[PDB]
Design an enzyme around this catalytic site. Structure first.
Site, PDB file in Angstrom:
ATOM      1  N   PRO A 293       0.814  -1.237   0.000  1.00 41.46           N
ATOM      2  CA  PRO A 293       0.000   0.000   0.000  1.00 41.46           C
ATOM      3  C   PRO A 293       0.842   1.280   0.000  1.00 41.46           C
ATOM      4  O   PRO A 293       1.790   1.386   0.783  1.00 41.46           O
ATOM      5  CB  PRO A 293      -0.870  -0.116   1.272  1.00 41.46           C
ATOM      6  CG  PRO A 293      -0.352  -1.279   2.047  1.00 41.46           C
ATOM      7  CD  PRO A 293       0.470  -2.132   1.121  1.00 41.46           C
TER       8      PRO A 293
ATOM      9  N   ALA B  34      -3.919   3.220   1.632  1.00 39.05           N
ATOM     10  CA  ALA B  34      -4.727   3.565   2.807  1.00 39.05           C
ATOM     11  C   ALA B  34      -6.009   4.323   2.414  1.00 39.05           C
ATOM     12  O   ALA B  34      -5.939   5.383   1.805  1.00 39.05           O
ATOM     13  CB  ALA B  34      -3.898   4.396   3.780  1.00 39.05           C
TER      14      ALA B  34
ATOM     15  N   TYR C 116      -0.719   5.362  13.343  1.00 42.73           N
ATOM     16  CA  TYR C 116      -2.097   5.775  13.125  1.00 42.73           C
ATOM     17  C   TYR C 116      -2.998   5.165  14.217  1.00 42.73           C
ATOM     18  O   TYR C 116      -2.481   4.634  15.188  1.00 42.73           O
ATOM     19  CB  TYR C 116      -2.498   5.430  11.705  1.00 42.73           C
ATOM     20  CG  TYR C 116      -1.592   6.084  10.673  1.00 42.73           C
ATOM     21  CD1 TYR C 116      -1.494   7.462  10.580  1.00 42.73           C
ATOM     22  CD2 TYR C 116      -0.847   5.312   9.771  1.00 42.73           C
ATOM     23  CE1 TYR C 116      -0.676   8.061   9.637  1.00 42.73           C
ATOM     24  CE2 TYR C 116      -0.019   5.905   8.824  1.00 42.73           C
ATOM     25  CZ  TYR C 116       0.065   7.272   8.756  1.00 42.73           C
ATOM     26  OH  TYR C 116       0.869   7.877   7.823  1.00 42.73           O
TER      27      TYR C 116
ATOM     28  N   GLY D  19       7.250  -2.142  -2.461  1.00 41.88           N
ATOM     29  CA  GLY D  19       6.791  -0.752  -2.490  1.00 41.88           C
ATOM     30  C   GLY D  19       7.587   0.050  -3.504  1.00 41.88           C
ATOM     31  O   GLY D  19       7.233   0.112  -4.684  1.00 41.88           O
TER      32      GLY D  19
HETATM   33  C1  LIG Z   1       4.859   7.377  -0.907  1.00 41.25           C
HETATM   34  C2  LIG Z   1       4.616   6.252   0.069  1.00 41.25           C
HETATM   35  C3  LIG Z   1       3.325   6.003   0.516  1.00 41.25           C
HETATM   36  C4  LIG Z   1       3.058   4.974   1.420  1.00 41.25           C
HETATM   37  N1  LIG Z   1       1.777   4.774   1.840  1.00 41.25           N
HETATM   38  C5  LIG Z   1       1.486   3.767   2.690  1.00 41.25           C
HETATM   39  C6  LIG Z   1       0.101   3.493   3.117  1.00 41.25           C
HETATM   40  O1  LIG Z   1      -0.797   4.239   2.668  1.00 41.25           O
HETATM   41  N2  LIG Z   1      -0.129   2.485   3.993  1.00 41.25           N
HETATM   42  C7  LIG Z   1       0.889   1.686   4.440  1.00 41.25           C
HETATM   43  O2  LIG Z   1       0.682   0.738   5.254  1.00 41.25           O
HETATM   44  N3  LIG Z   1       2.174   1.883   4.054  1.00 41.25           N
HETATM   45  C8  LIG Z   1       2.542   2.872   3.223  1.00 41.25           C
HETATM   46  N4  LIG Z   1       3.886   3.050   2.814  1.00 41.25           N
HETATM   47  C9  LIG Z   1       4.932   2.126   3.314  1.00 41.25           C
HETATM   48  C10 LIG Z   1       5.159   1.068   2.223  1.00 41.25           C
HETATM   49  O3  LIG Z   1       3.971   0.309   1.958  1.00 41.25           O
HETATM   50  C11 LIG Z   1       6.272   0.085   2.559  1.00 41.25           C
HETATM   51  O4  LIG Z   1       5.861  -0.668   3.715  1.00 41.25           O
HETATM   52  C12 LIG Z   1       7.634   0.752   2.818  1.00 41.25           C
HETATM   53  O5  LIG Z   1       7.915   1.769   1.860  1.00 41.25           O
HETATM   54  C13 LIG Z   1       8.804  -0.226   2.784  1.00 41.25           C
HETATM   55  O6  LIG Z   1       8.841  -0.965   1.564  1.00 41.25           O
HETATM   56  P1  LIG Z   1       9.826  -0.592   0.329  1.00 41.25           P
HETATM   57  O7  LIG Z   1      11.219  -0.441   0.915  1.00 41.25           O
HETATM   58  O8  LIG Z   1       9.647  -1.818  -0.524  1.00 41.25           O
HETATM   59  O9  LIG Z   1       9.241   0.682  -0.210  1.00 41.25           O
HETATM   60  C14 LIG Z   1       4.173   4.094   1.899  1.00 41.25           C
HETATM   61  C15 LIG Z   1       5.466   4.350   1.440  1.00 41.25           C
HETATM   62  C16 LIG Z   1       5.731   5.382   0.545  1.00 41.25           C
HETATM   63  C17 LIG Z   1       7.156   5.587   0.105  1.00 41.25           C
END
Ligand SMILES: Cc1cc2nc3c(=O)[nH]c(=O)nc-3n(C[C@H](O)[C@H](O)[C@H](O)COP(=O)(O)O)c2cc1C
Ligand SMILES: Cc1cc2nc3c(=O)[nH]c(=O)nc-3n(C[C@H](O)[C@H](O)[C@H](O)COP(=O)(O)O)c2cc1C
Lengths: 348, 348
Positions: free
Chosen positions: A22, A57, A176, A317
């Site tokens: 997400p 989210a 949150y 992500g």
């Molecule tokens: C721009 C952005 C928006 C994100 N929005 C959410 C979200 O809405 N809900 C959530 O649980 N995590 C959110 N995350 C966290 C990511 O889902 C993920 O857990 C985190 O970036 C680590 O993974 P990665 O290193 O593969 O990006 C967000 C991250 C980024 C960079």
């Protein structure tokens, strides 16, 4: 290669073990509605080859929004947009899922590229402690406020099902609402919902139970948690094991293992796979299925954590913001000939 | 880094020197209309970061189609779809362009993934020689037929301009109509349009001149050619130089240098950059601006051919079917911090 072997959860079969994590796009209307941005962004990644897409989210009530441009699901007039989004994800090849959300004491900030400052909303939480300097002091919830928000989660979930989403994730992480009930750094209550571990888990476990009763067993229910808050005397991995045990008993399908976000002034040992040990410890010490996430960026990395038994699902992500077709090229790199749209056959 | 330095052509400024090469998707309606497939496919690559998108071969009359699922521009009822396509490319960040096309003796085949067999259409060409076994014998064009098709190119171009496209490319390559007039392997005429080099260039040069008169000097006009046909006693690099000289004098802005496709039984020495010497020889021996294309897949490769003076523009095909965000990550790899949508800022 386990990475491109089918996964059975509930009544479904995901065609592989990759999922889009997400990621808030801050591009909805002021009424929380789906726009052209989302209808390009998400199906691009479904063509890119993930088995499961978890939409960003989505706010269960207006005060639950992170920003004035978050997606919402508090109204029947969100249904046409959400239904169109799920339909387009499905037709591009992926199972559509969605994360349900309430921002709590971190609600109501500006977009990241407009400064990200608090807008002074009348936010809620467990205890009257601000998140940081400049932030509004949240108003403590009474039992009627808790019930209202709980009902909003139950109705939010029914509405996601009516739109065609087949995986529902509860966002109980990153500081949150429900995450802030768990950690002692944000929750200093002296009633039934604070103090002991059991008290701090109470409102989060009530939400989970109530949603599980409206989601049929054929469709998976996920929970995202911060496995630790990284703060001295805060929520630990051991607490996460106790919490995972209780989720397992209620019929939760999988625990999505993240960390951090409760407080701001903490040291975090960032490295490839730094959150994988939390997923590994729940899966092996409790027997609940897990999702691994956090700086996973290569095919060989993701394959190896599956071989080790550390998780059932791998979540991506940031790599998918800059490389949406990663899973198609990852397959090839592991010696599996990928399934691609026929239009792109000569590209592989 | 010249690769991410602006390019001035005509009245425009492209923000970089990368372009999406024309690539038939075989996904239009039976009336040649734009569909949902194109409205996802093309703007994905515009967000991906190219300065210029050249939309696939678009048929100037129905018998000019490669397949029953090609795009068309023979009718005013193609205007709403084409206008929507160009608008969405522009809003995702790229200049929209389009290639104009007539398939000739290779018209009317099935899709590549449905066997690709000839459907027995009443195709046209310079001489009555089939392309291969199984193919229909084309009917030789008389002067009135040539004029009809020439008018279709002129009207096709006016209609592209009305839809909002700012670059027009003429497809005179790959064994289709105008390419087949150039090569002696397909053209054995004994009138004014066959025999000598000057005769074989005549109909192709008439098309170019007429289109140039309806496209204002502020908007660039491109031509794509097969620089060689690889067949013994066929069209050569030396012929290409003579042809490029004549295009330069008529006001053509840039020559897009491809090869092959006239005949089927020829040996082709495929390797990274194998068509770059053709672009290099026109640009340096004639002084006409060039586009390089053919197995260009890395940032350092594309930068080096620009530094050597071999071309003005680099065209990418297959790498963008499997990696549409290549140009954003290429920038970073050359030490330029790319311009990205604000939604994806934390991905870079
Ligand atoms: C721009 C952005 C928006 C994100 N929005 C959410 C979200 O809405 N809900 C959530 O649980 N995590 C959110 N995350 C966290 C990511 O889902 C993920 O857990 C985190 O970036 C680590 O993974 P990665 O290193 O593969 O990006 C967000 C991250 C980024 C960079
Ligand atoms: C599926 C497919 C469709 C193509 N369609 C066209 C076309 O419509 N017009 C054209 O001039 N070239 C077409 N080409 C050729 C490409 O534009 C390009 O010149 C060629 O693939 C070499 O570049 P690459 O190695 O970067 O792909 C096509 C190639 C492919 C693979």
């Amino acid at each position: 290669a386990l990475l491109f072997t089918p996964l059975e959860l509930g009544g479904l079969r995901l065609k592989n073990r990759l999922a889009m994590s997400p990621m808030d796009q801050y591009s909805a209307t002021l009424e929380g509605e789906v726009t052209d941005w989302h209808l390009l962004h998400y199906p691009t990644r479904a063509l890119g080859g993930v088995g499961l897409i978890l939409v960003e989210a989505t706010a269960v009530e207006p005060l639950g929004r992170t920003s004035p441009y978050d997606l919402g699901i508090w109204s029947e007039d969100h249904l046409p947009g959400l239904k169109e989004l799920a339909r387009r994800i499905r037709e591009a090849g992926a199972v559509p899922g969605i994360q349900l959300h309430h921002a709590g004491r971190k609600a109501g900030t500006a977009r990241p590229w407009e400064g990200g400052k608090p807008l002074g909303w009348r936010v809620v939480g467990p205890s009257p402690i601000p998140f940081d300097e400049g932030y509004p002091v949240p108003e403590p919830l009474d039992e009627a406020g808790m019930e209202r928000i709980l009902q909003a989660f139950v109705e939010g979930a029914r509405r996601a099902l009516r739109a065609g989403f087949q995986v529902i994730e509860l966002h109980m992480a990153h500081g949150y609402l429900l995450s802030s009930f768990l950690s002692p750094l944000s929750n200093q209550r002296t009633d039934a919902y604070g103090g002991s571990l059991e008290n701090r888990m109470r409102f989060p476990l009530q939400v989970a139970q109530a949603v599980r009763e409206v989601v049929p067993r054929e469709l998976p229910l996920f929970v995202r948690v911060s496995a630790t808050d990284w703060g001295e005397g805060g929520w630990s991995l051991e607490d996460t094991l106790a919490f995972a045990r209780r989720l397992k008993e209620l019929g939760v399908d999988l625990l999505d293992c993240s960390s951090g976000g409760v407080v701001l002034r903490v040291r975090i040992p960032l490295a490839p796979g730094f959150q994988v040990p939390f997923a590994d410890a729940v899966r092996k010490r409790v027997g609940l299925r897990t999702g691994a996430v956090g700086l996973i960026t290569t095919p060989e990395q993701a394959e190896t954590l599956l071989q080790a038994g550390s998780a059932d699902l791998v979540l991506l992500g940031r790599v998918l913001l800059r490389d949406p077709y990663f899973p198609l090229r990852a397959a090839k790199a592991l010696g599996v000939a990928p399934e691609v749209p026929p239009q792109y056959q000569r590209g592989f």
